[PDB]
Design a protein around this ligand. Structure first.
Ligand code: BNG
Ligand code: BNG
Ligand code: BNG
Ligand code: BNG
Ligand code: BNG
Ligand code: BNG
Ligand code: BNG
Ligand code: BNG
Ligand code: BNG
Ligand code: BNG
Ligand code: BNG
Ligand code: BNG
Ligand code: RET
Ligand code: RET
Lengths: 235, 233
């Protein structure tokens, strides 16, 4: 409990702040010398991901955007708004990388980000719900939007990426498989965590999310920005 | 006979001038806005191939730089110095594109370019020769140097390029095959043309060299420049 406010999870919120900074700085340092046209677009977008994330973690660290929601079980919970505002801007940027990688139309991209934004906001509403029946409704509403995200990713984007070269479609697939597995752990951890079953306390959960967040931002970013697939001057 | 100067092959040299110029401009236009630093290097090198050829083809059109050679048989021939000047500076540049893709070292490049220059120079010495024995001796030597170039591509360069990404490796192999088929045609066209057995007249020979030159420069250049293999470093 670094800030001595009863929340020993700030331990994780801190490491996450740093780790996200390091990833951000690493991407910038590495993108500094890139001249390739399209490659520079991917960097700009991806740099913002851990960038925005480290700023949301610093806030959660100082416990800047948290409120309480006393459940019906008498046990009150503290909800971090920054976490959701983070995912609200970050997940759309990661999806953009994939959209750019697949070369899909602007209409499909708008729908993609839309359902994705709907996923985070509903997940927010649920977290803020008092009864376990309400939290499941909002959770189902959110997991559905997520399945839709996965759907446009595994059909539209993928079939469009299929038309690109092997180099590009090989990375799209890799990153789309990563997203499919990695992102699926969020609804799970959420429902088994403090918002659902409670098999995990506020501590370990915060640590698990941080590990997922970093892998989904710095790890994803590393695999993408490190490949030739972002290279492009087109036709 | 465009210049109406008793030589109708000018019809093929004029067309070659245009296609060489057109290709040079398409390459500049397509590369001007490319920011990929490494891709900009391939463009610079390549633009000069049809560029230098354009000039060489214009010179030959107006009959600049030509010299007569009376064979021992009595027959006399016109030797367009400009053709060998073109090749002398052009084949090395094409070879450089390949060296770049493969990422071979500077020494290899050096012996590669050196052997290519020998090939052109000895070929020109054959063209200026007075006897079939002298002409075919240099032709043979020049052809052996060609085989040396071919050997470097199929072994050293090809080996080094295999160490690179699939995309790079793929484009290198395609272009190397293109050289193996296109370049092989020059010695053959020379030996069966007015410089050799004389089965083909000066008119067709020029038509054939024009086709070969444009494919080997603009064609080759197009395949390279539109590939993802010149991206990144
Ligand atoms: C906290 C870290 C902040 C980022 C630091 C600035 C990044 C410096 C990276 O060096 C760059 O390397 C390129 C070649 O790779 C050169 O072409 C370029 O000119 C040079 O500037
Ligand atoms: C909502 C998503 C579906 C998950 C359902 C998990 C099983 C039901 C858990 O109910 C209980 O609810 C209380 C608040 O009402 C909590 O204080 C208590 O720890 C929790 O055990
Ligand atoms: C609970 C979460 C609900 C999420 C609902 C998301 C709906 C997204 C709409 O997509 C659009 O549907 C059109 C047909 O109606 C298609 O012609 C168009 O191409 C497609 O982009
Ligand atoms: C390293 C060697 C580089 C050589 C460069 C070749 C330049 C081309 C010059 O061609 C010259 O054109 C003259 C007519 O204008 C002819 O009278 C002369 O005989 C002929 O040679
Ligand atoms: C670095 C070494 C380069 C060697 C190049 C070979 C040059 C051979 C020149 O032969 C000469 O050709 C003349 C016609 O052009 C003949 O009239 C003359 O009788 C004959 O002797
Ligand atoms: C290893 C180098 C080999 C070079 C071979 C080139 C041979 C060119 C043909 O020459 C000709 O041979 C005839 C006899 O067969 C002579 O009667 C004739 O006068 C002579 O001009
Ligand atoms: C190290 C590689 C060497 C390449 C060898 C090429 C040898 C070419 C020999 O040509 C010979 O020319 C004679 C006239 O001069 C003809 O009478 C004879 O029938 C013909 O066969
Ligand atoms: C690096 C590739 C080297 C290829 C060498 C092959 C040389 C073949 C030259 O022989 C010629 O073949 C013509 C038919 O094609 C005949 O009409 C002609 O009388 C004969 O002299
Ligand atoms: C390195 C391999 C090079 C292979 C070159 C093959 C050239 C074939 C040219 O065929 C020509 O087609 C004309 C119709 O288009 C006919 O009128 C003409 O009589 C016929 O000779
Ligand atoms: C090792 C190098 C081998 C080169 C072989 C090329 C041989 C070319 C054959 O000579 C040509 O034969 C014609 C008749 O068929 C003659 O009309 C012509 O005047 C003569 O030049
Ligand atoms: C990849 C293989 C490329 C082969 C290119 C060959 C050059 C183009 C054709 O030139 C000439 O056309 C004449 C008809 O117009 C034919 O009678 C003559 O025999 C042929 O030589
Ligand atoms: C790289 C691919 C090369 C493919 C070869 C294409 C050869 C096209 C020849 O066309 C025409 O043939 C007539 C004779 O039939 C000539 O009288 C006429 O002048 C010529 O223009
Ligand atoms: C950098 C952060 C990332 C990639 C966050 C991803 C978050 C999700 C995929 C969240 C999904 C959720 C549901 C499907 C329902 C339950 C609530 C959420 C918000 C955890
Ligand atoms: C743009 C022009 C190119 C790629 C020219 C290539 C020329 C050759 C490979 C020439 C080879 C020759 C011999 C092997 C011997 C006979 C004389 C030459 C110069 C025609």
């Amino acid at each position: 409990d670094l800030l001595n406010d009863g929340r020993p999870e700030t331990l994780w919120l801190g490491i996450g702040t740093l780790l996200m900074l390091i990833g951000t700085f690493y991407f910038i340092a590495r993108g500094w010398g890139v001249t390739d046209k399209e490659a520079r677009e991917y960097y700009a977008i991806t740099i913002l991901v851990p960038g925005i994330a480290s700023a949301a973690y610093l806030a959660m660290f100082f416990g800047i955007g948290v409120t309480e929601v006393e459940l019906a079980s008498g046990t009150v919970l503290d909800i971090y708004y920054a976490r959701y505002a983070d995912w609200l801007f970050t997940t759309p940027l990661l999806l953009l990388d994939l959209a750019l990688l697949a070369k899909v139309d602007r209409v499909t991209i708008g729908t993609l980000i839309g359902v994705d934004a709907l996923m985070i906001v509903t997940g927010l509403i649920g977290a803020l719900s008092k009864t376990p029946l309400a939290r499941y409704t909002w959770w189902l509403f959110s997991t559905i939007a997520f399945l839709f995200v996965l759907y446009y990713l595994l059909t539209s984007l993928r079939s469009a990426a299929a038309k690109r070269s092997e180099e590009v479609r090989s990375t799209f697939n890799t990153l789309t498989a990563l997203v499919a597995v990695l992102w699926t752990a969020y609804p799970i951890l959420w429902i088994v965590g403090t918002e659902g079953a409670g098999v995990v306390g506020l501590g370990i959960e915060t640590l698990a999310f941080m590990v997922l967040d970093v892998t989904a931002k710095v790890g994803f970013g590393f695999v993408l920005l490190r490949s030739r697939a972002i290279l492009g001057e087109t036709e």
